[PDB]
Amino acid sequence: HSDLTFCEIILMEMESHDAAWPFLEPVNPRLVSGYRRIIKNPMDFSTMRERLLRGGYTSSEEFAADALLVFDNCQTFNEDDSEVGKAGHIMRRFFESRWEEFY
Numbered sequence: 001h002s003d004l005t006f007c008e009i010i011l012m013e014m015e016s017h018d019a020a021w022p023f024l025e026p027v028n029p030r031l032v033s034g035y036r037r038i039i040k041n042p043m044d045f046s047t048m049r050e051r052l053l054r055g056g057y058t059s060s061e062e063f064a065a066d067a068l069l070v071f072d073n074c075q076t077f078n079e080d081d082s083e084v085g086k087a088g089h090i091m092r093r094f095f096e097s098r099w100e101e102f103y
């Protein structure tokens, strides 16, 4: 239980973070040119939110794999100095930090 409750703590904190604006909702491929082709397995916070509430996570590790996928996808598609990229690095460092001062 305590595994999944901190996933709630960290997802909530990521949802309300200042730099979370690029990851709240799935990327719209109609609007983002080339995203469908480049990103095979998209992931975002709302999709993680949906899965967590239905309890579709077996361990904290499956949750972390989805979080890392958000930021891997971000670094794959966006330049490190882009606005989305700059925001992804803040979010990735925030996640790794808060994930470690638990485990």
Ligand SMILES: Cn1cc(C(=O)NCCN)ccc1=O
Pocket: 021, 022, 023, 027, 032, 073, 074, 077, 078, 084
């Ligand atoms: C994660 N990600 C977000 C965007 C974006 O523009 N998000 C704000 C929505 N209006 C573009 C490329 C990308 O990889």
